[PDB]
Design a binder for this molecule. Sequence first.
Ligand code: BCL
Ligand code: BCL
Ligand code: BCL
Ligand code: BCL
Ligand code: BCL
Ligand code: BCL
Ligand code: BCL
Ligand code: BCL
Ligand code: BCL
Ligand SMILES: CC(C)=CCC/C(C)=C/C=C/C(C)=C/C=C/C(C)=C/C=C/C=C(C)/C=C/C=C(C)/C=C/C1=C(C)C(=O)CCC1(C)C
Ligand SMILES: [Fe+3]
Lengths: 49, 49, 49, 49, 47, 306, 299, 32, 38, 38, 37, 38, 37, 38, 37, 37, 38, 37, 38, 37, 37, 37
Amino acid sequence: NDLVPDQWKPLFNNAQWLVHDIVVKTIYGGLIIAVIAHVLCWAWTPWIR
Amino acid sequence: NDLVPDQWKPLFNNAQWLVHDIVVKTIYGGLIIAVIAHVLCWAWTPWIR
Amino acid sequence: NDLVPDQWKPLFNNAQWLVHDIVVKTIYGGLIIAVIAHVLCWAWTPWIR
Amino acid sequence: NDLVPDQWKPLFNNAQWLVHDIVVKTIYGGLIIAVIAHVLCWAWTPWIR
Amino acid sequence: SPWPVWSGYALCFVPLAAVILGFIIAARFTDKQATSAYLRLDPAKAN
Amino acid sequence: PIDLHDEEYRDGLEGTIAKPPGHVGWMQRLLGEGQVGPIYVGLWGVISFITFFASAFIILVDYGRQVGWNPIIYLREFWNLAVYPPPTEYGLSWNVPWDKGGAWLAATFFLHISVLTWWARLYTRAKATGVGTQLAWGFASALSLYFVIYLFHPLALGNWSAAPGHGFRAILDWTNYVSIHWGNFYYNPFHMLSIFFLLGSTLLLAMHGATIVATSKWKSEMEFTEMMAEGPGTQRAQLFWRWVMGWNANSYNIHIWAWWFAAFTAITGAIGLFLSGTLVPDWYAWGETAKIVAPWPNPDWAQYVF
Amino acid sequence: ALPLPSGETLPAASAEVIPFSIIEEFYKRPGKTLAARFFGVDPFDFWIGRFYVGLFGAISIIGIILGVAFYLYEGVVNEGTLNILAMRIEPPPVSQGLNVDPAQPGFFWFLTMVAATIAFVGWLLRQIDISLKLDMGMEVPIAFGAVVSSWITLQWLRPIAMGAWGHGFPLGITHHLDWVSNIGYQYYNFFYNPFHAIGITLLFASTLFLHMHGSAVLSEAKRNISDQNIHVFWRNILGYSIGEIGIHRVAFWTGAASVLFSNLCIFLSGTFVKDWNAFWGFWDKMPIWNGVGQGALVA
Amino acid sequence: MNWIVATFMLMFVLVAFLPLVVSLAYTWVTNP
Amino acid sequence: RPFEFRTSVVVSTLLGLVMALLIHFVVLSSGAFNWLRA
Amino acid sequence: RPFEFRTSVVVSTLLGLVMALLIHFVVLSSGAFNWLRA
Amino acid sequence: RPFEFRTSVVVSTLLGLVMALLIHFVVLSSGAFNWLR
Amino acid sequence: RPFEFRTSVVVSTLLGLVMALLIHFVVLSSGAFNWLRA
Amino acid sequence: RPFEFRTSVVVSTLLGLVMALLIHFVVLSSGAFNWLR
Amino acid sequence: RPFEFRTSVVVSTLLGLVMALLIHFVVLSSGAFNWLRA
Amino acid sequence: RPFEFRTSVVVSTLLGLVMALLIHFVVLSSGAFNWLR
Amino acid sequence: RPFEFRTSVVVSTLLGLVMALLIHFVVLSSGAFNWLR
Amino acid sequence: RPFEFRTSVVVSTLLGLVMALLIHFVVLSSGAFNWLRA
Amino acid sequence: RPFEFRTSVVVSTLLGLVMALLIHFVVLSSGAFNWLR
Amino acid sequence: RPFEFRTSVVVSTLLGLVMALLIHFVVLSSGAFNWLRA
Amino acid sequence: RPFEFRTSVVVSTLLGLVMALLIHFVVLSSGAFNWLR
Amino acid sequence: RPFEFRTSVVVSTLLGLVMALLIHFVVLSSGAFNWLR
Amino acid sequence: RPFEFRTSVVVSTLLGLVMALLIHFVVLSSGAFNWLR
Ligand code: BCL
Ligand code: BCL
Ligand code: BCL
Ligand code: BCL
Ligand code: BCL
Ligand code: BCL
Ligand code: BCL
Ligand code: BCL
Ligand code: BCL
Ligand SMILES: CC(C)=CCC/C(C)=C/C=C/C(C)=C/C=C/C(C)=C/C=C/C=C(C)/C=C/C=C(C)/C=C/C1=C(C)C(=O)CCC1(C)C
Ligand SMILES: [Fe+3]
């Protein structure tokens, strides 16, 4: 747990920190794409009315 | 439980405090978002009348 | 743990790095082919209208 | 793994390199024959139109 | 219309292939675990 | 850390009753054990007892009222008496006459409470005895089917009439009526999967029982000991099933196989029953559109006439 | 570390780590099959791979191959459907009777049904032989014989008793269900058949017993317990524990009994009974209550 | 209906019931 | 002493709850009070 | 002591949740309040 | 302590998810909002 | 720590995939978007 | 590490194959492209 | 001795009770005595 | 003694209660007394 | 003594409650008193 | 030797008997010879 | 000797019995002999 | 030796007999030769 | 070696025989050759 | 290594055979090529 | 002795009771004697 920060040392491991970073970046990209897709779909056909 | 406050030491662990704090912030954000969503839905179409 | 980079030593084995590289290259090629196929299909017949 | 290349020594045996070569040559021949068959079939009757 | 509907596709042919592959895989791994080497009583001494 | 003598011989609430065990004799001769033994009562089971018998009392009193309080006619028509849910009008309302579905709702509510408390009893006793809690999740998988039949399906359809009528003959009628209403469950894919798993479960039970009984001369029925080291009986069973069909298992995998057969049976049945009415109003028409229905132009119908 | 049969790796009884090869070699002991007693020698008394081939193994394999060939031929040829979920393999018409003619349609149904019967009986006899080579009991043959008798009732006894031979089931995937539905609704309320109800009860009890036994055995596999925890658990809930040897006996008996009662009800429904609603007309006329009611409560 | 053939087939079915009964009787006779 | 305080409390609470629920259900189904529906 | 705090908390919470669900369903299905299109 | 953090977290998450799905499906099936036609 | 990383990852991935499939099915079945031939 | 390489490869390959077959069959059955008559 | 006193008593009492109930029910259903409103 | 006092008391009480219930129900259902409408 | 106080109390309480509920139900169903409409 | 004499005898005799029975049955079922009123 | 005399006798006798029963059944089932009328 | 002689002989004999039976049955049922009453 | 000669021979022979039977049956079923009446 | 050579060979060969059979069957069933009548 | 006295008595009594009940019920149902109206 050398690379883990001081705050999250009791919770995280040196190996799990990297995978957590990967997952966080993936979710960030997915959220960006989801927002873009929702905006395009609303521009195409509104669903609330 | 070094980081745990004095009052809540017998009930919480050091690692559990951080997870509890994360859950508390998540619940507070969800509650704010839900209040906003309910206000917009009422402004759109009342369900009681 | 000799052909793996320093960052990914705790996560990767010296024999699985080669397989990972092969998989990454295959996924990249498949993505490029899929993008080209989608562009051609859209130019042929739009599916949204 | 005397006959195996240095890059692929950790992944391949000495008796598996030959079988891999046979499989690769068979797949290449299959790809060439499939390409020819697809070209003749398209020349006979298009399937997209 | 020589083809089935999409709901037919899913509801019929996804579970069927899933069941076939799952049965074959489970049988293979059950046999692997069964035929492995572990503690046993010697048949020559055991009667 | 667990004293079995205490867990079997305590007193009062959180204890046991019927403490002096009985003996039947013929069960000892035919099944190998005949101890009636004590039974636990721990506040998860008193609630089940009270609620189940409240429901039974309601149903039996309604049965009595339906025959004019005539005991002889009560014995006459016991097996064709039922307490049906409210009619199709006033779909999910509770303001119903007692003789027009009022008693059905109360009995069903108490039965739900009883089954949930029984699951709690099973879970708590499994925890308190030191064993795992697989039986609780199996019962959960059957309660899933039960709750789909009695609660979740009448909901999302809009009426209470989509549920059985609490009778010996009423469940058979419910099965027939539900089959006729929604086309034919012979063309329901989840009915097919449930039947596959059910018949597989029966087949596996028969095979396992016969296999263990055949090799019982070498003490093959002591599953707990064989999981530590194999014996001659287990070896003979493995060899037999390897030479018959070419593959076999050990004395630990077969139980996983059986558990998952039963669980899949319950889950697939629940899913099929729920999907039957809300999304596919006619199963035969769906099967025709899916190309899983055989053509049948020129029947020979003389088989089906008297 | 000693590997346990469950999968545990427990650091260190008379047990030891023995490969399966030694056990497989030790227990061969050729020369004790049923055919050896009759003819003095088994023509096929060897193993081909993991399987043991005997006199009846050859008969079973011949029947299997021939039946599969005939089934595919009736369904790919003479029907021209090319898919297996729309095939419809019918017996001869009821008008034809109990006789078979190659020219008339329905002959390959005869061929497939005969080949399947031969294969099933051969499999039963092979199971008997393998049981007899290992000095085991004959329990699995009893259960499988119950199943095979269920087959023979549906495909041989009922058509012969009814005498027209068009009364056997088509061998088609999703199409034998049509036969089941039509037969069940011809004798309306097949629920009200007593033996069908007993069979359904036994089937449901078998499934419940299998789930209970699997849960009970799996709940103690990898724990430090004294082997008597399961008995206390089963006496605290329901107030009775059957024991180790009773559960398998109950399983075998329930499994056999369900199929036995089912074949009984199908045969009885075929010939001796016509309507299962009229079967219960005797109940309300018994002279203990036939005079106690009025209006809708009469009878 | 020919009632002789039907009764014969019924007798065969009741014969098919027999092996389970024999197993039950064997289990009872042993384990005294 | 014949009974424990736990058993008495549990039995009394369960009996009261069941009786209240049953009485409320019967009164609602009778429809003799003009309550919760015309 | 008679009862543990754990058991009391569990029973109280479960009873409250069940009663809330039942009361909501009974009141809304009565068709006497005009909620979500009558 | 009477209850562990893990059990409370699990029960709260399951209850919240079930309630969200139930309320969404009830509102959609009521047909009183003009949502998704 | 109350929960391991593997449990969180597995639950999150399963929930996300199931929700995505369900939402696509519910949106595309409504026939209110004119996608892929109406 | 939390997950091993073989599990990731197996899950990814299975998901890809299933989605590809399902998408081709849905598109073919929709009859909105003029593909294969 | 071939039988115990307890079994004889039990069998005799059960047979007597069942026979008495059966005879009373048959006579009531016969409608041949003008008893309990014909 | 062939029987205990407990068994005799139990059997007698159950038989008496069942018989009383049966007789009251028969008399009420016969409708020959003008009791309870 | 043949019977203990606990068993007698339990049996008496159950019998009394069952009889009272049965009598109220029969009286309500008879419709001869003008009670609850 | 690969096969024993008695095994060959058993196999040959059984195959011949089965084939003879099959051929008589098929010829009779064909109904092309006027045998036993056929 | 390749075959014991006892085994040959038993096999021949059983084969003869089965053949006699089968031939009687087939001849009596035929249309020429209607089960001896 | 990859295979034993007896296994080869047995497999060949079974395959040949099955093929002959299948071919005779197919040709007889096709009715394209006028053999055994057309 | 990964695969034995015997396994390869068995698999190849079974595949070839099954393929030959399937192709003959399909060609016969199609009815595009005027073969065997 | 994660996967042995034999497993890869088996998986690839089976997948290729299954896909080839499925594609041939689909193309024949489409009736869009004028092949086999 | 091949059979016990107890089994003989049990079988005989059961057979006698069953026969008597059957004969009375059959004679009653025949309607041949004018017994009980
Ligand atoms: C609309 C008018 C309706 C009606 C509709 C309802 C409905 C609907 C409900 C009640 C409920 C109740 N009704 Mg009212 N009720 C009516 C008439 C009556 C009459 C009467 C005329 O005699 C009576 C005596 C009652 C009596 C009662 C009580 C039993 C109860 C409210 C008090 C209570 O228990 O608080 C004690 C309650 C609590 C301590 C709960 C506290 C819960 C906390 C605040 C959390 C709530 C959940 C929330 C989602 C949490 C979010 C955060 C997450 C946890 C992270 N009602 C009429 C017919 N009534 C409610 C109830 O609780 O029933 C069991 C209920 O649901
Ligand atoms: C109905 C109107 C629109 C439309 C509206 C939208 C909108 C709006 C959105 C999408 C989104 C998506 N759409 Mg859509 N969509 C349309 C038509 C389509 C069609 C089609 C054939 O017509 C397709 C194929 C898709 C496909 C997709 C996906 C690319 C995407 C959701 C991915 C997902 O599952 O994330 C969830 C997946 C996961 C949680 C799993 C991730 C797993 C990763 C990738 C791999 C892990 C491997 C590793 C080993 C795992 C470890 C753990 C294991 C347990 C061991 N759309 C129509 C035309 N679509 C969404 C999007 O953009 O998302 C970014 C979105 O918000
Ligand atoms: C009304 C005319 C009816 C008829 C109506 C009845 C009825 C009704 C009954 C009989 C019964 C009998 N009938 Mg008559 N019977 C008819 C015609 C016949 C004919 C005939 C050829 O015609 C014959 C042979 C018989 C023969 C018989 C006997 C089998 C039997 C009476 C003897 C007996 O067992 O005493 C031995 C009987 C006893 C020892 C009983 C002792 C019971 C004790 C005294 C307790 C009584 C209850 C008391 C309240 C207990 C209180 C204390 C508490 C327990 C603490 N009946 C006609 C058709 N018959 C009775 C019987 O017992 O059937 C089994 C019976 O109930
Ligand atoms: C109205 C006229 C009706 C009729 C209505 C009834 C009814 C109704 C009943 C009887 C009962 C009986 N009937 Mg009458 N009966 C009729 C005609 C007959 C004829 C006939 C040939 O015509 C006969 C032979 C009988 C014979 C009999 C007996 C078997 C019995 C009464 C004696 C008994 O058992 O005492 C012994 C009885 C006791 C010792 C009872 C003691 C009860 C104790 C005191 C408890 C009482 C309850 C009290 C509330 C307890 C309170 C405290 C709590 C316990 C804490 N009836 C006609 C048709 N009969 C009663 C019976 O018990 O049948 C089994 C009965 O219920
Ligand atoms: C039909 C005309 C009248 C009518 C006529 C009568 C008459 C007449 C009487 C009653 C009586 C009663 N009526 Mg009314 N009644 C009517 C309408 C009603 C309505 C209603 C909703 O309309 C209700 C709720 C009631 C309610 C009641 C009860 C208060 C009472 C019966 C109590 C009981 O069960 O005792 C039986 C109960 C028990 C045996 C259990 C006691 C339990 C104790 C109290 C608690 C502790 C238990 C202990 C801990 C257990 C220990 C052992 C355990 C095993 C551990 N009536 C109408 C209006 N009603 C009776 C009465 O006055 O009773 C006093 C009565 O005689
Ligand atoms: C009537 C015309 C029919 C037809 C009817 C048949 C029939 C009928 C049969 C064949 C068989 C065969 N057919 Mg042709 N066949 C037709 C058209 C064709 C066409 C074609 C392109 O049109 C082809 C390629 C074939 C090809 C073939 C071969 C696969 C095979 C013959 C050679 C063989 O196996 O030798 C090798 C054969 C042997 C080595 C056999 C040796 C047998 C030994 C000598 C024993 C003989 C039996 C004797 C009773 C034993 C007594 C023992 C006692 C102890 C004394 N047929 C047409 C449609 N064909 C035969 C076959 O074997 O099928 C499997 C067969 O039965
Ligand atoms: C009539 C024209 C039909 C057609 C009818 C058939 C039929 C019918 C068959 C084939 C078969 C095949 N077809 Mg073609 N086929 C057509 C069009 C095609 C097209 C195309 C794109 O148009 C292609 C690519 C093919 C390709 C193929 C091959 C896959 C295969 C032949 C080679 C092979 O694998 O040999 C490998 C096979 C061998 C090496 C076998 C060797 C067997 C030895 C010689 C023994 C034979 C039996 C022996 C005599 C028995 C007795 C032994 C005793 C000891 C005496 N066909 C058209 C539609 N095709 C044949 C095949 O074998 O498929 C698997 C086959 O049966
Ligand atoms: C007629 C026009 C049809 C069509 C008909 C077919 C058919 C039919 C098939 C394919 C197959 C394929 N098609 Mg195409 N296909 C069409 C349009 C397309 C389109 C498109 C976007 O339009 C695409 C992307 C593809 C793509 C593809 C690939 C997925 C695949 C060939 C690749 C491969 O694995 O080669 C590599 C191929 C090999 C390595 C095979 C090697 C086989 C070896 C040589 C053995 C052959 C048998 C021989 C008898 C053996 C004898 C010796 C014994 C074994 C000892 N097709 C149209 C709609 N296509 C083929 C395929 O392989 O599917 C899996 C296939 O069967
Ligand atoms: C009315 C004329 C009817 C008819 C009506 C009946 C009726 C009704 C009955 C018989 C019975 C019998 N009939 Mg007749 N029967 C007819 C014509 C015939 C013909 C004929 C060829 O015509 C024959 C051969 C018979 C022959 C027979 C016998 C098999 C049998 C009587 C003897 C016996 O076995 O006693 C053996 C039996 C005993 C010795 C039993 C003794 C029982 C003792 C006496 C106790 C009885 C109960 C008593 C209440 C106990 C009290 C004390 C308490 C226990 C403490 N019947 C015609 C058609 N028959 C009776 C019988 O029992 O059949 C089995 C019977 O019930
Ligand atoms: C239709 C009608 C009429 C209905 C009747 C109306 C009724 C009866 C309504 C009842 C409503 C109720 C009872 C609603 C309840 C809502 C709840 C409990 C929500 C819980 C949210 C829980 C939340 C957000 C929990 C989040 C948990 C998180 C973020 C966990 C995070 C984590 C934890 C803790 C870890 O370990 C490690 C991983 C990670 C860090 C991600
Ligand atoms: Fe077991």
